[PDB]
């Protein structure tokens, strides 16, 4: 009865959609052809829809302008799973240009995208909200994501939207003009995304290096871990638990002010197959490891700031009194400090289903897990660094012609700069104690 | 550069030991014509690139689905 | 089943008897596993049209892989005259059961014990060509014949004449003793110069043959042996002049 | 000196996934070295474990340091070539004129040095018997042989070993038994042959015919139902250490000599769940269910059905004490005294309750089929 | 899909393109008769990018062959892989340019270019979606440097949005081959700057140094140099033809590498290059590849990179590797050599990944760089030009065919201007 | 409408244990008989020692 809609745009969006969908298919035991051997509760309704006889079709849509990834998916190992004409592919790359995908080429695909969204939402009956995946530091991703958010925020309105975006690392970065796109996309998403989640790359690189002891990781490990996080987040809607929390119990329990909805995640335990069975895997130790700054999902030091709200979701056979005692110790230790106007800051969710493991993966089969989502004032530094880079490379009108020649006016940079400065001022102001 | 010079046309053997004799030797061994075929033609591919290990891998964007655990098939109880 | 599903994909649905007739028309070997490569080749040739001036190229049958077996033969040449016999002996040894075909891993083993570290991609081409319908077994006789190449009719007839001449002195009866007692070890210089001594030449010859001197020999096995010897030599003239010295004929 | 290396895989249970090691074997001094393919650390270094040379072969299972390993294949050309010789398969047959001599026949076959890979006994019905020996048809031997064939229960076995296809035949002796006595008295046909059509045993002659009989008799698609009864009978099990130490021939004839009638024996490979499950009556009693169950699954084992007027307690009388150390002192002529070593591996195991023999024999001969 | 057409003019262009098409056909597994005999299916997914299918199933290149004399085309047609090119794609003159830019750019170049314009028009309009044009030519010759650049201007006139790449065999004084180099060089680089979207400069002297040092071949041949240029130029466009983890098109490269509209002259390099006797004695790893590619002596240009600061750079890795080591090597090379990179633009390195290495190879690296060190070529060319022009030597063969010295003065002024504001950023600080 | 399947599944689930207990007691009685049998056998063995 309850469903969500998955939006996947950009190469990052598609390469994370592949991982999240293989994980979801494996968790419900759906074969790649879509059939259910089974051998029956309706726990697949959240992500899949029955075709009337046999197979199940995911409730997701894929957008991108360069056909390469889409064709590779259509010829991959899940060729007969997805709906063939909901994998919308464009003609020409936006090629790392914000204006291209938002003013010139992106306007001829939004009509098809909205038509497909309408067709799928009409099939849906108890829609909970939207989960969007996009890469900010790229032309087509940023532009099409901004345009889609603009269109949905007017067409559908109050239905919640959560965006799992991938900002640049402080130094581990690929593109050179990418800060421009990042600033403009943040400007676009600030007043349109209900929740935003940080998914930078080098932090997860450090995570996999330190825990799995994998010296040769690629994008696949990153995407698998991110998919694990998403599944742990969305388990409660489809699995039985002691304290179920739905998607509407995120912004009502985690967003102090409408402007402040940027958040950063963490997941535990992260361990290999050899080091796990010689370890204790206690609830207290995993919840202590969840708060380690080096275990955090994004390159920020939360010790440089305060905490506003945290939502933690356990899966496995955890016990509520154990959770309460662990949280008491968390509040007891002084290294982490909360804000005065938040006496109670913890949301607790519990799910009975233990985490599922993928064959050929890196993580071991574990019987307890915790996924934590935190809103904190320590998000200021990443935006400060992005602004610093933007100012340094904008002092002399670098690469401005590439943007102005596509139709976008010059003055848009100033507006984004001033709005980001206002956001930084707001995060500063909320940090003063009464 | 006073190459060629005191090393004229010769096939097989260890040569004369002046100039780049070592480097021409392995070229002459792997392929006929150690140096500059007379205008038996010379293919630039072997001269430039090197030893050819013919292999074409997979994209590994298509390795997402396929992963096998032989253990699961045990009868258990 | 997959074939009729593919027909449904294009939208041409027909009853089972017509489907069976269409399937059998192209499944000539009656094995039951059609090759859509040949299927689409036939359709492409049909759709290209008829033009006397220009041929439609394309393919109606799987081609010989070419350079993988070419390099195989070239690098097999270097080990020596009896490298070819080595592959035959290894095939018989690996086929401990005497069926005439080998499993896939067994073919891999025989290749690596010959000593060629073929990569997966290079191996796959020859593998897929030599196993037409993915039955699971490969016929080693055809493989070795193609690797060796083509034998001349006059050469084979001369080999038969040598076998008959050898059998004549023994009264039609065969033994490896006869070939060991009568031959020319020094004739090997003309197929290729070698510095090894004549006293040892007998030792290598008996070693590459069997230890027992009373083993039964068939005419086909004998001519097969000298065909393996010939395949190392690139000149029919040199080979037959070597055979003439070897049997004093 | 020279090294034999393999590839082996071990199924962990705390970890679901299975691992893989190499198990190099220094033969000059009989020691074992363990090294794993993935993550590149040495697993077990330079410790002798006293493993006999004969048991190393494809598909073998060997325990070491409380973990059981199963060899899958070799790891290099040098190891592969040496053991590639010993793989020939032959199909031997025991016709019912020597049903009383099964133990001696098996003893001689084992002493020959070959390995009894698989074994079964059945009733060769008329139609499939006519199908078998198809090539003969025209000759007068045909009808007489067919009428002889379906007479009684038959024992079919497979022999794997070096030079086996003719080694088995030369051990067997001449085709006719009348000649066999004057030419080769010390032969199977010489000792247990009566006349031309009543020859003791049968062997293969060509590899193709041997394979034909093999997939006729042992393949998964066979028309030979396991002819066996399920009333007034007792079940017994030859433990794997007995067949490893090669006394199965002696054991079988001993129980045949006691007037008991053997009804069916078959070779079985079973895993640890099956082992604990068949021993479901000894979980909470002192015979140390865990150790005996884990040992029972460490190799092939024969399951015999024995028939007699009062099967259970009478067979128990010959079986004697469950502990051979008990048995040696007091019951010196009982089979467990003669063959058992200690508590865990006390040779034969038979039922020890009056009314549960039928269910146990049904478990082996109906459920595990 | 997003296909590109090929145009080559002059002797240098013809030979370079012949080698390039042999390389591409070898990579895609196409026989000299034009029949596919490849192994894997990946070779056919994007085969339409560089080839067109004809009746019967044979593939033909979409290349245009252009020159004022028939000898070089008659040679290339007779040479290997000469049968692939469609005979109608040849356009040739009967007179020749005589290494005179005016001859190749005003009189017979103009009366001849109508046919080649028609052919390129029909070829471009035939395909579904053009992505751009690539030109290979020499600025030191007559017919190439004149007619090719006039064709560049013409095609840019009707295709203002599509990208244009040039591969220019610029002259170097060490290996001097013609006395009238300064004139046609300056004029070609004049009408090149306002039209060519990207330029890639190549030096024969640099190629000779590379061949003698890295490959260490006793007596090389233009086949070797053409093959190296073909390898780099083919490696440029791998993301368009093969799947990968980070696809990057020519527009992506232009956006990431062009800070200002007039700074589009680029210098390139290829890795790895090893001697035949030392092929088995070195490992293959990302640190080794980056160490080899960043080497200044490895570059395909006579300019010394360490005499100026890199503005932007891009690398197109091929084969199997991991993104963390890729980006970590970029970060390390950016940190340990901060002096050679301009500071007011942070993270001036692009990395892109393709899953398909060149045939017979495990990993390959193509590097393209925009750096201030290229000003030296224009400086020396302008020095020669002014020194030889103050005496008006060889000038009358130009001036007697509709040429005026005022546009020579314009060319000198424009090149000095480009040098001025192109070295200004070397000293420019934030 | 969906409640019927829940009702059925609960009924089968509880009946399963309802019969499992009988199976367990059937297995358990043989435990005691066999234990007594070997108990008497062992003491007879000891006394004859
Ligand atoms: N972690 C992770 N990041 C990815 C992956 N694929 C792409 N990205 C991110 O995407 C960013 C660049 O955007 P692109 O992936 O090239 O695509 P885009 O954002 O839609 O814009 P275009 O490049 O024009 O297509 C890089 O900085 C990467 O961080 C991936 O598989 N894993
Ligand atoms: N690298 C390289 N340079 C070449 C080749 N052919 C000619 N050149 C150079 O081109 C210059 C002469 O150009 P030219 O053919 O007269 O130009 P065109 O008259 O316009 O065709 C000489 O300086 C040569 O060094 C070649 O195959 N490779
Ligand atoms: Mg893209």
Cα–Cα distance for residue pair E332/E146, rounded to 1 Å: 44
Which of A194, A312, A305, A309 is closest to A256 using CA atoms?
A309
- Contact (CB, 8 A) for A266 and A371: yes
Tokens 């045949």 locate to D256
Contacts of C110 (CB under 8 A, 6+ apart): C87, C90, C91, C94, C102, C140
The answer to whether the CB atoms of A273 and D39 lie below 8 A apart is: no
The answer to whether the CB atoms of D39 and A274 lie below 8 A apart is: yes
C104-114 vs D77-84: helix crossing angle, rounded to 10: 120
Q: Is A97 annotated as a binding residue?
A: no
Expressed in angstroms and rounded, the spacing between residue E138 Cα and the centre of ligand 2 is 7
- Contact (CB, 8 A) for E35 and E82: no
Q: Which two tokens stand for residue C86?
A: 């080595």
% helix / strand / coil in chain F, to the nearest 5? 95, 0, 5
CA atoms within 13 A on the CB side of A383: 26
Using what technique was this structure determined? cryo-EM
Write down the domain spans for chain A.
3-262, 263-381
CB neighbour class for A370 (10 Å; exposed up to 12, middle 13-18, buried from 19): buried
**E138 CA closest ligand 2 atom index:** 17
Q: Does E298 sit in the ligand 2 pocket, CB within 6 Å?
A: no
Closest CA to ligand 1's atom 7: A12
E181-193 vs E375-389: helix crossing angle, rounded to 10: 130
Contacts of D357 (CB under 8 A, 6+ apart): D233, D234, D235, D311, D312, D351
Contacts of E96 (CB under 8 A, 6+ apart): E68, E69, E143
Query: Degrees (nearest 5) of the Cα angle B44, B48, B53?
Result: 100
Residue B33, Ramachandran bin (φ over 0: left; ψ between -120 and 50: alpha; else beta): left
Decide if A3-262 and A263-381 have a common fold: no
Reduced to 3 states (helix: H, G, I; strand: E, B; else coil), residue B30 is: helix
Cα–Cα distance for residue pair D175/D184, rounded to 1 Å: 11
φ and ψ at D205, to 5 degrees? -130, -30
Kindly provide the b/e burial profile for residues C215-240, where b requires at least 16 CB atoms within 10 angstroms of the residue's own CB. eebeeeebbbbbbbbbbbbeeeeebb
φ and ψ at E171, to 5 degrees? -80, 150
Contacts of D350 (CB under 8 A, 6+ apart): D234, D235, D236, D237, D315, D316, D319
Which of A196, A433, A251 is closest to A338 using CA atoms?
A433
C83-94 vs C104-114: helix crossing angle, rounded to 10: 150
Which of E224, E255, E276, E271 is closest to E370 using CA atoms?
E255
| End-to-end CA separation in angstroms for chain F | 74
C2-10 vs C16-26: helix crossing angle, rounded to 10: 110
Tokens 């290729």 locate to C192
- Cis, peptide link before residue E175, omega less than 30° from 0: no
Q: Across-strand partners of E227?
A: none
- Contact (CB, 8 A) for A379 and A297: no
Tokens 């400086």 locate to E379
Sheet containing D3-4: give its strands across: D3-4, D24-26, D31-35, D42-47
Residues 411-430 of E with CB under 8 A from A: 428, 430
**E176 CA closest ligand 2 atom index:** 23
Which of E241, E82, E252, E226 is closest to E167 using CA atoms?
E226
Cα–Cα distance for residue pair E50/E52, rounded to 1 Å: 7
Query: Degrees (nearest 5) of the Cα angle C120, C122, C126?
Result: 110
Q: How far is CA E238 from CA E221, E242, E319, E327, E366, in A?
A: 27, 6, 11, 19, 10
Q: How far is CA E27 from CA E21, E79, E135, in A?
A: 10, 19, 21
Q: Which two tokens stand for residue A85?
A: 């004409």
Which of E312, B1, B57 is closest to C121 using CA atoms?
B57
Ranges of H-type helices in A304-346 = 320-332
- Contact (CB, 8 A) for E44 and C40: no
Which of D2, D153, D164 is closest to D86 using CA atoms?
D164
Q: Which two tokens stand for residue E124?
A: 């471009």
Cα–Cα distance for residue pair D278/D297, rounded to 1 Å: 11
Residues 39-78 of D with CB under 8 A from A: 39
Q: Does E222 sit in the ligand 2 pocket, CB within 6 Å?
A: yes
Per-residue DSSP letter, D36? B
Cα–Cα distance for residue pair E24/E30, rounded to 1 Å: 9
Kindly provide the b/e burial profile for residues E252-279, where b requires at least 16 CB atoms within 10 angstroms of the residue's own CB. bbbbbbbbbeebbbbbbbbbbbbbbbee
Q: Which two tokens stand for residue A283?
A: 């609830």
Resolution in A: 4.1
Expressed in angstroms and rounded, the spacing between residue E12 Cα and the centre of ligand 2 is 5
| Three-state SS letters, chain E | CCEEEEEEEHHHHHHHHHHHHHHHHHHHCECCCCCECCCCCHHHHCHHHCEEECCCCCEEECEEEEECCCHHHHHHHHCCCCCCCCHHHEEECCCCCCCCHHHHHHHHHHHHHHHHHHHHHHHHHHCCCEEEEEEEEECCCCHHHHHHHHHHHHHHHHCCCCEEEEEEECCCCCCCCCCCHHHHHHHHHHHHHCCCCEEEEECHHHHHHHHHHHHCCCCCCHHHHHHHHHHHHHHHCCCCCCCCCECCCHHHHHHHHCCCCCCCEEEEEEECCCCHHHCCCCCCCHHHHHHHHHCHHHCCCCCCHHHCCEEEEEEEEECCCCHHHHHHHHHHHHHHCHHHECCCCCCCEEEEEECCCCCCCCCEEEEEEEEHHHHHHHHHHHHHHHHHHCCCCCHHHHHCCCCCHHHHHHHHHHHHHHHHHHHHHHHCCC
Cα–Cα distance for residue pair C162/C246, rounded to 1 Å: 10
Pairing mode of beta strands D301-307, D233-238: antiparallel
A263-381 carries CATH number 3.30.1330.20: yes
Other C-beta atoms lying within 10 Å of the C-beta of residue A126? 9
H or E stretch at D261: strand D261-268
Other C-beta atoms lying within 10 Å of the C-beta of residue E153? 15
Residue D209, Ramachandran bin (φ over 0: left; ψ between -120 and 50: alpha; else beta): alpha
Cα D204 to the center of its chain, rounded Å:
19
Which of A29, A402, A47 is closest to A234 using CA atoms?
A47
- Contact (CB, 8 A) for A169 and A201: yes
Q: Is E109 annotated as a binding residue?
A: no
Expressed in angstroms and rounded, the spacing between residue A12 Cα and the centre of ligand 1 is 4
Tokens 């106007």 locate to A341
- Cis, peptide link before residue A269, omega less than 30° from 0: yes
Pairing mode of beta strands E3-9, D261-268: unpaired
Q: How far is CA D257 from CA A252, D190, D246, E47, F30, in A?
A: 86, 22, 19, 81, 32
How many secondary structure helices (H) and strands (E) does chain D include? 16, 16
Q: Could you say which ligand is closest to the alpha carbon of residue A218?
A: 1
Closest CA to ligand 1's atom 21: A138
Kindly provide the b/e burial profile for residues A132-168, where b requires at least 16 CB atoms within 10 angstroms of the residue's own CB. bbbbbbbbbbbbbbbbbbbbbbeebeebbbbbbbbbb
CB neighbour class for E206 (10 Å; exposed up to 12, middle 13-18, buried from 19): buried
Tokens 């098409």 locate to E21
Cα–Cα distance for residue pair C42/C60, rounded to 1 Å: 6
Cα–Cα distance for residue pair C127/C129, rounded to 1 Å: 6
Among 3.40.50.460, 3.30.1330.20, 2.40.50.140, 3.40.50.1860, what is the CATH number of E265-374? 3.30.1330.20
Contacts of D189 (CB under 8 A, 6+ apart): D172, D173, D174, D175, D176, D177, D180, D199, D200, D201
Cα–Cα distance for residue pair B43/B52, rounded to 1 Å: 14
% helix / strand / coil in chain B, to the nearest 5? 25, 0, 75
- Contact (CB, 8 A) for C175 and C213: yes
Cα–Cα distance for residue pair E18/B44, rounded to 1 Å: 13
CB neighbour class for C135 (10 Å; exposed up to 12, middle 13-18, buried from 19): exposed
Write down the domain spans for chain E.
3-256, 265-374
Q: Measure CB to CB from residue F45 to each of D284, D285, D326 and give the nearest one.
A: D326
Fold of the CATH domain A3-262: Rossmann fold (3.40.50)
Per-residue DSSP letter, A168? P
Contacts of C23 (CB under 8 A, 6+ apart): C3, C34
- Contact (CB, 8 A) for E297 and E209: yes
Which of A345, A339, A279 is closest to A311 using CA atoms?
A345
Ligand 1 binding site (Cβ under 6 Å of any ligand atom): A 10-12, 15, 93-96, 135, 137-141, 166, 174-175, 201, 219, 222-223; E 246
Instruction: Work out whether the CA dihedral E297, E301, E307, E313 comes out positive or negative.
Output: negative
Pocket test for ligand 1, best of A63, A132, A138 (most atoms within 8 A of CB): A138
Q: Which two tokens stand for residue E313?
A: 């750079």
Which of E236, E10, E4 is closest to E133 using CA atoms?
E4
Cα–Cα distance for residue pair A9/A133, rounded to 1 Å: 6
Cα–Cα distance for residue pair E245/E249, rounded to 1 Å: 13
Pocket test for ligand 2, best of E12, E180, E206 (most atoms within 8 A of CB): E12
Q: Give strand ranges (E) for A167-236.
A: 195-198
φ and ψ at A431, to 5 degrees? -85, -10
Per-residue DSSP letter, B14? -
Q: Which two tokens stand for residue B71?
A: 């253990």
Instruction: Work out whether the CA dihedral E118, E119, E124, E128 comes out positive or negative.
Output: positive
Q: Measure CB to CB from residue C112 to each of D73, D77, D89 and give the nearest one.
A: D77
D136 tagged catalytic = no
| CATH number for the domain formed by residue range(s) E3-256 | 3.40.50.1440
Cα–Cα distance for residue pair D222/D208, rounded to 1 Å: 18
φ and ψ at A372, to 5 degrees? -120, 140
CA dihedral B68, B73, C1, C5 (to 10 degrees): -50
H or E stretch at D316: helix D311-319
Q: How far is CA D51 from CA D32, D42, D292, in A?
A: 9, 20, 21
The answer to whether the CB atoms of D321 and F45 lie below 8 A apart is: yes
Cα–Cα distance for residue pair C106/C91, rounded to 1 Å: 9
Kindly provide the b/e burial profile for residues A327-352, where b requires at least 16 CB atoms within 10 angstroms of the residue's own CB. beebeeeeeeebbeeeeebbbbbbbe
Reduced to 3 states (helix: H, G, I; strand: E, B; else coil), residue D290 is: helix
Compute and round to an integer the Cα radius of gyration of chain C: 24
- Contact (CB, 8 A) for E200 and E368: yes
A380-394 vs A412-429: helix crossing angle, rounded to 10: 150
Entry field: residues in chain A: 434
Pairing mode of beta strands D6-11, D3-4: unpaired
Q: Could you say which ligand is closest to the alpha carbon of residue A66?
A: 3
H or E stretch at D163: none
Which of A14, A217, A362 is closest to E246 using CA atoms?
A14
Cα–Cα distance for residue pair A73/E81, rounded to 1 Å: 36
Cα–Cα distance for residue pair C145/C151, rounded to 1 Å: 9
Q: Measure CB to CB from residue E312 to each of A172, A176, A219 and give the nearest one.
A: A176
Residue E352, Ramachandran bin (φ over 0: left; ψ between -120 and 50: alpha; else beta): beta
Other C-beta atoms lying within 10 Å of the C-beta of residue A204? 26
Q: Give strand ranges (E) for D288-327.
A: 301-307
Compute and round to an integer the Cα radius of gyration of chain F: 22
Q: How far is CA A342 from CA A60, A312, A321, C16, E249, in A?
A: 37, 16, 22, 73, 50
Cα–Cα distance for residue pair C135/C103, rounded to 1 Å: 10
Concatenating the DSSP letter of every residue in C155-177 gives: HHHHHHHHHHHHHHHTTS---HH
């Amino acid at each position: 009865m309850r469903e969500v809609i998955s939006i996947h745009v950009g190469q990052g969006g598609i390469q994370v959609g592949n991982a999240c969908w293989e994980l979801f298919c494996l968790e419900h035991g759906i074969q790649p052809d879509g059939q259910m051997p089974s051998d029956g509760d309706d726990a697949f309704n959240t992500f899949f829809s029955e075709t009337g006889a046999g197979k199940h079709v995911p409730r997701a849509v894929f957008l991108d302008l360069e056909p390469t990834v889409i064709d590779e998916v259509r010829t991959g190992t899940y060729r007969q799973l997805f709906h063939p004409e909901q994998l919308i592919s464009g003609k020409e790359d936006a090629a790392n240009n914000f204006a291209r995908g938002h003013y010139t080429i992106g306007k001829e695909i939004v009509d098809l995208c909205l038509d497909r969204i309408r067709k799928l939402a009409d099939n849906c009956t108890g829609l909970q909200g939207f989960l969007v995946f996009n890469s900010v530091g790229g032309g087509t991703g940023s532009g099409l994501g901004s345009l889609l958010l603009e269109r949905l925020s007017v067409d559908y309105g109050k239905k919640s939207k959560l965006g799992f975006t991938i900002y640049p690392s402080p130094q581990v970065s690929t593109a050179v003009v990418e800060p421009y796109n990042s600033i403009l996309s943040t400007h676009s998403l600030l007043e349109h995304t209900d929740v935003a989640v940080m998914l930078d790359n080098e932090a997860i690189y450090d995570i996999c290096r330190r825990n799995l002891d994998i010296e040769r990781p690629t994008y696949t490990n990153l995407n698998r871990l991110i998919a694990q996080v998403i599944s742990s987040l969305t388990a409660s809607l489809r699995f039985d638990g002691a304290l179920n929390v739905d998607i509407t119990e995120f912004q009502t329990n985690l967003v102090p002010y409408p402007r402040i909805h940027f958040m950063l995640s963490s997941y535990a335990p992260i361990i290999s197959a050899e080091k796990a069975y010689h370890e204790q895997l206690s609830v207290a130790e995993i919840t202590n490891s969840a708060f380690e700054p080096a275990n955090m999902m994004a390159k920020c030091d939360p010790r440089h700031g305060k905490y506003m709200a945290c939502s933690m979701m356990y899966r496995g056979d955890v016990v509520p009194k154990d959770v309460n005692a662990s949280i008491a110790t968390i509040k007891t230790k002084r290294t982490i400090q909360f804000v005065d106007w938040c006496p109670t800051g913890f949301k607790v969710g519990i799910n009975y289903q233990p985490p599922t493991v993928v064959p050929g993966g890196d993580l071991a089969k574990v019987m307890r897990a915790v996924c934590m989502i935190s809103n904190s004032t320590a998000i200021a530094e990443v935006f400060s660094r992005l602004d610093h880079k933007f100012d340094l490379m904008y002092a002399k009108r670098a690469f401005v012609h590439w943007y102005v020649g596509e139709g976008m006016e010059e003055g848009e940079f100033s507006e984004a700069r001033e709005d980001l400065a206002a956001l930084e001022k707001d995060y500063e102001e909320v940090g003063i104690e009464t | 550069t006073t190459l060629e010079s005191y090393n004229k046309q010769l096939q097989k053997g260890q040569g004369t030991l002046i100039g780049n004799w070592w480097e021409e030797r392995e070229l002459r061994d792997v392929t006929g014509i150690g140096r500059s075929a007379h205008n038996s033609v010379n293919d630039t591919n072997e001269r430039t690139m090197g030893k050819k290990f013919n292999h074409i891998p997979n994209t590994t964007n298509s390795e997402y689905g396929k992963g096998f655990n032989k253990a699961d098939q045990l009868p258990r109880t | 089943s997959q074939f009729k599903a593919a027909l449904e994909k294009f939208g041409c649905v027909f009853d089972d008897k017509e489907i069976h007739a269409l399937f059998s028309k192209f499944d000539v070997n009656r094995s039951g596993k059609i090759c859509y490569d040949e299927f689409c080749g036939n359709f492409a040739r049909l759709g290209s049209g008829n033009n006397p001036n220009v041929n439609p190229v394309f393919k109606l049958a799987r081609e010989v892989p070419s350079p993988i077996i070419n390099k195989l033969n070239a690098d097999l040449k270097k080990q020596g005259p009896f490298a070819f016999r080595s592959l035959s002996k290894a095939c018989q040894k690996a086929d401990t059961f005497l069926n005439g075909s080998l499993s896939h891993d067994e073919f891999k083993w025989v290749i690596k014990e010959i000593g060629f570290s073929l990569t997966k991609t290079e191996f796959d081409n020859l593998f897929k060509f030599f196993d037409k319908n993915y039955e699971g077994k490969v016929i080693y006789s055809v493989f070795i014949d193609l690797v060796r190449g083509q034998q001349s009719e006059i050469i084979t007839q001369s080999l038969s004449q040598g076998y008959d001449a050898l059998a004549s002195n023994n009264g039609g009866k065969v033994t490896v003793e006869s070939i060991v007692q009568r031959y020319n070890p020094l004739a090997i210089q003309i197929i290729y110069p070698t510095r090894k001594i004549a006293q040892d030449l007998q030792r290598e010859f008996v070693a590459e043959w069997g230890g027992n001197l009373q083993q039964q020999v068939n005419k086909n096995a004998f001519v097969e042996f000298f065909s393996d010897v010939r395949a190392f030599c690139d000149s029919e003239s040199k080979f037959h002049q070597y055979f003439s010295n070897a049997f004093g004929l | 000196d020279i090294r034999y290396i393999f590839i082996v895989e071990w199924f962990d249970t705390a970890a679901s996934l299975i691992r893989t090691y190499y198990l190099t074997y220094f033969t000059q001094d009989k020691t074992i070295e363990m090294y794993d393919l993935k993550n590149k650390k040495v697993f077990l270094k330079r410790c002798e474990y006293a493993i006999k040379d004969s048991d190393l072969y494809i598909g073998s299972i060997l325990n070491v340091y409380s973990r059981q390993l199963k060899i899958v294949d070799f790891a290099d050309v040098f190891t592969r070539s040496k053991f590639q010789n010993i793989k020939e398969k032959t199909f031997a047959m025991i016709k019912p004129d020597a049903y009383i001599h099964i133990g001696k026949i098996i003893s001689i076959i084992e002493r020959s040095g070959l390995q009894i890979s698989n074994l079964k006994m059945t009733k060769m019905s008329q139609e499939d018997a006519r199908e078998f020996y198809g090539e003969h048809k025209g000759k007068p031997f045909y009808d007489g042989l067919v009428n002889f064939m379906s007479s009684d229960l038959i024992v079919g076995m497979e022999l794997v070993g070096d030079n086996a296809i003719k080694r088995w035949r030369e051990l067997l002796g001449p085709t006719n038994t009348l000649v066999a006595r004057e030419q080769a008295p010390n032969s199977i046909r010489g000792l247990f042959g009566t006349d031309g059509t009543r020859n003791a045993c049968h062997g293969s002659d060509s590899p193709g015919s041997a394979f034909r009989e093999l997939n006729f008799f042992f393949a998964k698609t066979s028309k030979l139902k396991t002819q066996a009864f399920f009333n007034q009978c007792t079940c017994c099990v030859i433990k794997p250490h007995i067949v490893k130490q090669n006394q199965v021939g002696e054991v079988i004839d001993m129980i045949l000599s006691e007037g008991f009638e053997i009804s069916a024996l078959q070779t079985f490979f079973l895993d640890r769940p099956t082992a604990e499950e068949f021993y479901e009556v000894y979980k909470g009693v002192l015979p140390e269910f865990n150790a005996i169950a884990e040992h029972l699954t460490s190799g092939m084992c024969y399951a015999l059905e024995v028939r007699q007027e009062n099967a259970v307690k009478s067979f128990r009388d010959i079986a004697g004490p469950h502990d051979p150390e008990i048995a040696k002192v007091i019951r010196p002529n009982t089979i467990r005294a003669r063959f058992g070593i200690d508590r865990v591996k006390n040779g034969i195991h038979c039922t020890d309750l009056e009314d549960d023999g039928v269910l146990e024999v049904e478990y082996f001969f109906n459920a595990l089929q | 899909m997003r296909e590109i057409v090929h145009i080559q003019g002059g002797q240098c262009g013809n030979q370079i393109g012949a080698k390039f098409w042999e390389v591409i056909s070898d990579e895609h597994g196409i026989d000299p008769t034009g029949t596919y005999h490849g192994d894997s299916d990946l070779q056919l997914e994007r085969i339409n990018v560089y080839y067109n299918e004809a009746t019967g199933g044979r593939y033909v290149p979409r290349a245009i062959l252009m020159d004022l004399e028939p000898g070089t085309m008659d040679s290339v047609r007779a040479g290997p892989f000469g049968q692939l090119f469609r005979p109608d794609n040849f356009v040739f003159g009967q007179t020749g340019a005589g290494n005179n830019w005016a001859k190749g750019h005003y009189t017979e170049g103009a009366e001849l270019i109508d046919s080649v314009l028609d052919v390129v028009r029909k070829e471009a309009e035939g395909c579904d979606c053009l992505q751009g044009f690539q030109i290979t030519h020499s600025l030191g010759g007559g017919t190439g440097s004149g007619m090719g650049t006039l064709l560049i201007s013409k095609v840019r006139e009707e295709y203002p949005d599509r990208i244009m790449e040039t591969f220019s065999v610029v002259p170097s004084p060490k290996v001097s081959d013609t006395v009238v180099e300064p004139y046609n060089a300056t004029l070609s680089v004049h009408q090149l700057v306002e039209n060519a979207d990207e330029c890639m400069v190549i030096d024969n002297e640099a190629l000779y140094d590379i061949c003698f040092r890295t490959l260490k071949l006793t007596t090389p041949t233009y086949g070797d140099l053409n093959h190296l240029v073909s390898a780099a130029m083919s490696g440029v466009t791998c993301c368009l033809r093969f799947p990968g983890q980070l696809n990057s098109d020519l527009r992506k490269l232009a956006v990431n590498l062009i800070p200002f509209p007039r700074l589009h002259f680029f210098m390139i390099g290829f890795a790895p290059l090893t001697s035949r006797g030392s092929q088995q004695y070195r490992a293959l790893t990302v640190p080794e590849l980056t160490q080899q590619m960043f080497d200044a002596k490895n570059m395909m240009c006579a300019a010394d990179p360490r005499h100026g600061r890199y503005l932007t750079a891009s690398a197109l890795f091929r084969g199997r590797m991991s993104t963390k080591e890729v980006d970590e090597q970029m970060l390390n090379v950016q940190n340990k050599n901060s002096s050679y990179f301009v500071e007011w633009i942070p993270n001036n390195i692009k990395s892109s990944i393709c899953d398909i290495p060149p045939k017979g190879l495990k990993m390959a690296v193509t590097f393209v760089g925009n750096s201030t060190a290229i000003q030296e070529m224009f400086k020396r060319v302008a020095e020669q030009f002014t020194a030889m022009f103050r005496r008006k030597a060889f000038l009358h063969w130009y001036t007697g065919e509709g040429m005026d010295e005022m546009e020579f003065t314009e060319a000198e002024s424009n090149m000095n201007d480009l040098v001025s504001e192109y070295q200004q950023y070397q000293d420019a600080t934030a | 409408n969906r409640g019927k399947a829940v009702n059925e599944g609960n009924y089968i689930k509880q009946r399963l244990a309802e019969l499992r207990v009988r199976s367990q007691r059937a297995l358990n009685e043989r435990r005691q008989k066999l234990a007594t049998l070997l108990g008497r056998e062992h003491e007879q063995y000891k006394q004859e020692i």
